[PDB]
Amino acid sequence: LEDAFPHLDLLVLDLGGDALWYPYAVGEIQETITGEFKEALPAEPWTLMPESDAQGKVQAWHQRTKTHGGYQTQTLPADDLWHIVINKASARDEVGISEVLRNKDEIQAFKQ
Amino acid sequence: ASSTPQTNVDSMGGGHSYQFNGQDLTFEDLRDIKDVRDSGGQVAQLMDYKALLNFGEGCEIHVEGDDETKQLVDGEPMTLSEWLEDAFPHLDLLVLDLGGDALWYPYAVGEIQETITGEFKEALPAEPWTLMPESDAQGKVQAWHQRTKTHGGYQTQTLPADDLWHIVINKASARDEVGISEVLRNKDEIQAFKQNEAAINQAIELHGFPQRHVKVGKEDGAPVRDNDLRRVRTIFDPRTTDANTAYFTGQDVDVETLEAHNFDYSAIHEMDMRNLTTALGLPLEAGNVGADGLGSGKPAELRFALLKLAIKANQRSFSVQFVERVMRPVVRDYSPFDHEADIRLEINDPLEDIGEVADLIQQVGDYMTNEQVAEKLDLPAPEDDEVADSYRSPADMEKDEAGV
Amino acid sequence: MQLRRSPGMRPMDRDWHQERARAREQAYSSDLTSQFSESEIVKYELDTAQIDGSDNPRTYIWNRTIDLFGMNGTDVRELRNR
Amino acid sequence: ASDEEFARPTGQGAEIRDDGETYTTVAWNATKLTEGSRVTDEMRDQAMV
Numbered sequence A: 001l002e003d004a005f006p007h008l009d010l011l012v013l014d015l016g017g018d019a020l021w022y023p024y025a026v027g028e029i030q031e032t033i034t035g036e037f038k039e040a041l042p043a044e045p046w047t048l049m050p051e052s053d054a055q056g057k058v059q060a061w062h063q064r065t066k067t068h069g070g071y072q073t074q075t076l077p078a079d080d081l082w083h084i085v086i087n088k089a090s091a092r093d094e095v096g097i098s099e100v101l102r103n104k105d106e107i108q109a110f111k112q
Numbered sequence B: 001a002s003s004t005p006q007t008n009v010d011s012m013g014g015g016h017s018y019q020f021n022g023q024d025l026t027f028e029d030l031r032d033i034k035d036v037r038d039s040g041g042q043v044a045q046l047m048d049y050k051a052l053l054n055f056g057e058g059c060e061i062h063v064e065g066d067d068e069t070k071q072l073v074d075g076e077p078m079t080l081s082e083w084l085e086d087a088f089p090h091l092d093l094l095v096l097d098l099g100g101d102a103l104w105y106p107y108a109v110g111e112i113q114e115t116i117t118g119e120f121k122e123a124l125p126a127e128p129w130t131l132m133p134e135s136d137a138q139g140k141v142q143a144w145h146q147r148t149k150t151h152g153g154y155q156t157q158t159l160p161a162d163d164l165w166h167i168v169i170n171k172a173s174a175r176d177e178v179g180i181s182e183v184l185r186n187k188d189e190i191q192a193f194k195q196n197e198a199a200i201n202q203a204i205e206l207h208g209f210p211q212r213h214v215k216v217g218k219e220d221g222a223p224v225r226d227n228d229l230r231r232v233r234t235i236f237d238p239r240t241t242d243a244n245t246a247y248f249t250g251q252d253v254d255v256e257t258l259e260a261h262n263f264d265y266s267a268i269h270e271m272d273m274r275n276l277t278t279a280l281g282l283p284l285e286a287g288n289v290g291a292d293g294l295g296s297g298k299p300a301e302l303r304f305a306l307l308k309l310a311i312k313a314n315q316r317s318f319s320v321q322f323v324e325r326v327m328r329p330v331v332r333d334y335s336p337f338d339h340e341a342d343i344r345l346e347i348n349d350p351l352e353d354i355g356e357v358a359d360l361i362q363q364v365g366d367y368m369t370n371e372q373v374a375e376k377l378d379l380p381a382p383e384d385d386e387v388a389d390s391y392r393s394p395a396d397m398e399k400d401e402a403g404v
Numbered sequence C: 001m002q003l004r005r006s007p008g009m010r011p012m013d014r015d016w017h018q019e020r021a022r023a024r025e026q027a028y029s030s031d032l033t034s035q036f037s038e039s040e041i042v043k044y045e046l047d048t049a050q051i052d053g054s055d056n057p058r059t060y061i062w063n064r065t066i067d068l069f070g071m072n073g074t075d076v077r078e079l080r081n082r
Numbered sequence D: 001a002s003d004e005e006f007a008r009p010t011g012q013g014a015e016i017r018d019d020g021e022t023y024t025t026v027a028w029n030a031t032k033l034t035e036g037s038r039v040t041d042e043m044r045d046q047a048m049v
């Protein structure tokens, strides 16, 4: 595991940072060309939102990204992404809460 | 899974022409950072203190299982650590200079160079404001575009993302390969500081000093014309007045004073410095501005812990990239050693107190090998491996050998 | 010998620069007599400055009597299509 | 700045005369040049470039 994840100290800080700002940290698994494991690759969390079933579990990930003068949008299965939630509405909350949006009024009050 | 990323990365822009893109940065935006860096004053010194904290205390190269690497390099044995210390003799200066430039600009960037014989020369840095990356739709940098001044205009050229290397300390996301300038991130705070400084300076010039107002003539009496005032000006001229000058007048000359009109410019400076220091993540103390209650107890412990955590995060961010993008390619391409070896570059803690370490070694040295003690104490490890590996002190082993 | 006010020295004086810049940002028209002291017109050679009111920010700022929408204080040369 | 001139020949012990540097100016204006274009979302999407 220590050879599989050499720089886990950076990855933990990066994902942990994102999962405080945004509702979730999210990413891919990546392989070498030979098909040995390469890395867990984070994805830009503001670009992705989950789609979830009647029992609340994530089934697909919908991604919108900037392009020159507009957006490209795609859908990916929950099968091959992974995601982590620090702040939750309930123990069943698989989508999570942004602490920024939870406290947006105090942020606005400060800035004004 | 996949051998290429299937998530997209939000970051198109420009081409050959300028665009106010937001994800990209122009040669003008880069030269703005250059201008903040070289225009000096309090802003520049704070960012220099930030560089000195992160990278000023120097560095050490480690390899796990370094002894197993023992090899004849040129009719003489070396380990990989010994070879690396010859490959990079003055790595401490390079770490400070690159690490500083990577805090100013979005990245540090540079070449690898060879001697004429083709052996490694140095990892020569490049002037970061001169260079910007071109990146593909899936996020990697593919080329570097360079603009450099010449005699009232510019040269321009393009280089592959192949024989250059680059290091990013500050990132928009964990997937970001181009990074953020903390200067341009806080440009509004920097201009707010500079404007209030100018406003105070001008207010001191106008209001910081009293001024004499001589009023001439009786109220509701005969009027006084400009040529009449010219002679009163001659008498009360501050340019020829001295400390103990005295005046003798009729009743109808009044020597009034504009008092120095009080304002708390010190409180305005304290506010400006609080804004700027906190925006740049430094403690307020770095700005030569004091605080109440924050100078003692757990309030001190916390802010110093937060500073040290920020420093460690930047140090690890720099270390990993420097090993992966500079050291490993140099080993792979110029060295008889295995580049896949577990190299670490570790950067010293700027705020560590050796007296605290000495106390620790007295308390718990009985649980540390002599090499672990030497490492904590910032010393060369013992030359003899058995004493290095043992737990009780080398002086204690010597006095026992002297008993034997 | 040359004094600060002397005609060959005016372009060396920081104040001649700063005050001509001020004069351009003050004006609403090219009519200097309507706007500047006769001392200023001579001292800063305001005949030779391109004073016309085109550099005054107040030329471009909206200032309607009643404002229900926060339109006032916008500068037209800072809109999207300018 | 005014052009280079010449020194003048002078008697011994005589007062040196003033030929100080004199200045004029070149005035810049600056005309706004502009260009623009518009593209619909549908056109931006469907174009092969």
Ligand SMILES: [Mg+2]
Binding pocket: B221, B222, B223
């Ligand atoms: Mg009278």
Ligand SMILES: [Mg+2]
Binding pocket: D005, D006, D007, D008, D019
């Ligand atoms: Mg002459």
Ligand SMILES: [Mg+2]
Binding pocket: D005, D019
């Ligand atoms: Mg002449």
